[PDB]
Ligand binder design. Structure first.
Ligand SMILES: *[C@@H]1O[C@H](CO)[C@@H](O[C@@H]2O[C@H](CO)[C@@H](O[C@@H]3O[C@H](CO[C@H]4O[C@H](CO)[C@@H](O)[C@H](O)[C@@H]4O[C@@H]4O[C@H](CO)[C@@H](O[C@@H]5O[C@H](CO)[C@H](O)[C@H](O)[C@H]5O)[C@H](O)[C@H]4NC(C)=O)[C@@H](O)[C@H](O[C@H]4O[C@H](CO)[C@@H](O)[C@H](O)[C@@H]4O)[C@@H]3O)[C@H](O)[C@H]2NC(C)=O)[C@H](O)[C@H]1NC(C)=O
Ligand SMILES: *[C@@H]1O[C@H](CO)[C@@H](O[C@@H]2O[C@H](CO)[C@@H](O[C@@H]3O[C@H](CO[C@H]4O[C@H](CO)[C@@H](O)[C@H](O)[C@@H]4O[C@@H]4O[C@H](CO)[C@@H](O)[C@H](O)[C@H]4NC(C)=O)[C@@H](O)[C@H](O[C@H]4O[C@H](CO)[C@@H](O)[C@H](O)[C@@H]4O)[C@@H]3O)[C@H](O)[C@H]2NC(C)=O)[C@H](O)[C@H]1NC(C)=O
Ligand SMILES: *[C@@H]1O[C@H](CO)[C@@H](O)[C@H](O)[C@H]1NC(C)=O
Ligand SMILES: C[C@@H]1O[C@@H](O)[C@@H](O)[C@H](O)[C@@H]1O
Ligand SMILES: C[C@@H]1O[C@@H](O)[C@@H](O)[C@H](O)[C@@H]1O
Lengths: 196, 207
């Protein structure tokens, strides 16, 4: 069993982070080998994290990739070997489309609660690789949860991010902002603010 | 060896006494050479005998697939009974066992809030009507949209999302033509869940 994983969306969009692809493999002294190919041609800058013994009786190899390589759609072939299995992944193919970002205040009806919901609708983006964060006065907020991307009826994706705050923090007029990073956006990043 | 997959009833099915909730046990990779299999069904570990097994269906990869459907009492699912399907075959003289039930935990009532389109989205030809459903447990839920009796076609609903208090939430988005929203048409988000009175609630939204 060989499983290939893509880099984190955030890591491919900021030139300062390190986007990896993670080839996971998953007890009679099994040796394993690893060959990495980028659009067919092989590369020798992988790294094999040390063996992991599981409760059921999990070797991993990690290859750093270039930001513009992943985003241009190059195929990443991970080839195992044990005395032969392959996997390939790439970015989803297609014209990237720019997320529209809309912040939605809490319902009047929710205002009878002690905490309230601040909503960030992110729609019309493609491919589904995206990252969403919340902050206020520069410091990130922690109490938020973001739905997975959902396929919309036009072949673009959407998601919602919900930020839970004390109603008083909302009543006091604090500024909350939803951050979105996506490849189709200008400088890969956009912000939208929400206040009372 | 074969493989067994056990599917729960649909959330609308268990919530409405008029519908027919079913647990479905599907066996794939049943050998072509000797394909006789047996289903044993158990409810809370007590064998039941009213399941309905389909005839084998020959697949296009030289295997067989067999389906058994167990009709469930609505209050049996909501009361958390466990459904085991056991699949036995004389081909390998082996047995595979799967168990499914409603997720354990105290049910919690969803709060349903409807959020109008953003002002910034009003420059588009279509606007987003949002239904926020939060604080519900377990995650089994159904969400629909309608207007003036008739249902609406152009909506999508996110999967349930585990929130930080252990309950679930989701959002449903209804896309409508800006004109329809600006005419004052009333739109309703309908939510179905065991912890709601009559298993159903409805919130409206208009300009
Ligand atoms: C005994 O040992 C273990 C028991 O623990 C078993 O291992 C499990 O086997 C399962 C099947 O054999 C397998 O299920 C598949 O899951 C994958 C998805 O894997 C992710 O999700 C799992 C559950 O959520 C995790 O446990 C996995 O570890 C993995 O999670 C993490 O995902 C991260 C994403 O945030 C990612 O981290 C990022 O990696 C990038 C890489 O670029 C960057 O580094 C970045 O910085 C990171 O954030 C990681 O990859 C990963 N975490 C790690 C590596 O630490 C799923 O795709 C797959 O589905 C395939 O097949 C189905 C067919 O049904 C098909 O529908 C799909 O299309 C797809 O083709 C399976 O569902 C488990 O993942 C796996 N657990 C492991 C390996 O830890 C063994 O199998 C047992 N031995 C046996 C049975 O013999
Ligand atoms: C020979 O051909 C056979 C026929 O295709 C192959 O059978 C297939 O075998 C695979 C596994 O090898 C099964 O995969 C599982 O599917 C589950 C979901 O299946 C539902 O959805 C699929 C579409 O995605 C659909 O085709 C199925 O028929 C099934 O539909 C549901 O059916 C029930 C009952 O009828 C109904 O109530 C539902 O409404 C209906 N749903 C929908 C949407 O239509 C997955 O859940 C399984 O995942 C398990 O394993 C995963 C491991 O990664 C794990 O992540 C999961 O959590 C879970 O543990 C699994 O993916 C196929 O269903 C099966 N096909 C059929 C038609 O039964 C056979 O494999 C092949 N053999 C060879 C050697 O090639
Ligand atoms: C056949 O199945 C029975 C029931 O589990 C088991 O006791 C028996 O050992 C199996 N046959 C063989 C040859 O092991
Ligand atoms: C399929 C695997 O089964 C075992 C667990 O310990 C792992 O977390 C994984 O879910
Ligand atoms: C042989 C199999 O039969 C059934 C289908 O669901 C599969 O896709 C495949 O064609």
């Amino acid at each position: 069993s060989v499983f290939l994983f893509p880099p984190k969306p955030k890591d491919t969009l900021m030139i300062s982070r390190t986007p990896e692809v993670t080839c996971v493999v998953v007890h009679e002294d099994p040796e394993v080998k690893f060959n990495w190919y980028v659009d067919g041609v092989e590369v020798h800058n992988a790294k094999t994290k040390p063996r992991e013994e599981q409760y059921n009786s999990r070797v991993v190899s990690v290859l750093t990739v270039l930001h513009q390589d992943w985003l241009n759609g190059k195929e990443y072939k991970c080839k195992v070997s044990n005395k032969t299995i392959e996997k390939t992944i790439s970015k989803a193919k297609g014209q990237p489309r720019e997320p529209q970002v809309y912040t939605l205040p809490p319902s009047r009806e929710e205002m009878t609660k002690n905490q309230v919901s601040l909503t960030c609708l992110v729609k019309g983006f493609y491919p589904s690789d995206i990252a969403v964060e919340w902050e206020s006065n520069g410091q990130p907020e922690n109490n938020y949860k973001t739905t997975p991307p959902v396929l919309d009826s036009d072949g673009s994706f959407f998601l919602y991010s919900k930020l839970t705050v004390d109603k008083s923090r909302w009543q006091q007029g604090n500024v909350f902002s939803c951050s979105v990073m996506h490849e189709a956006l200008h400088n890969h990043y956009t912000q939208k603010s929400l206040s009372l």
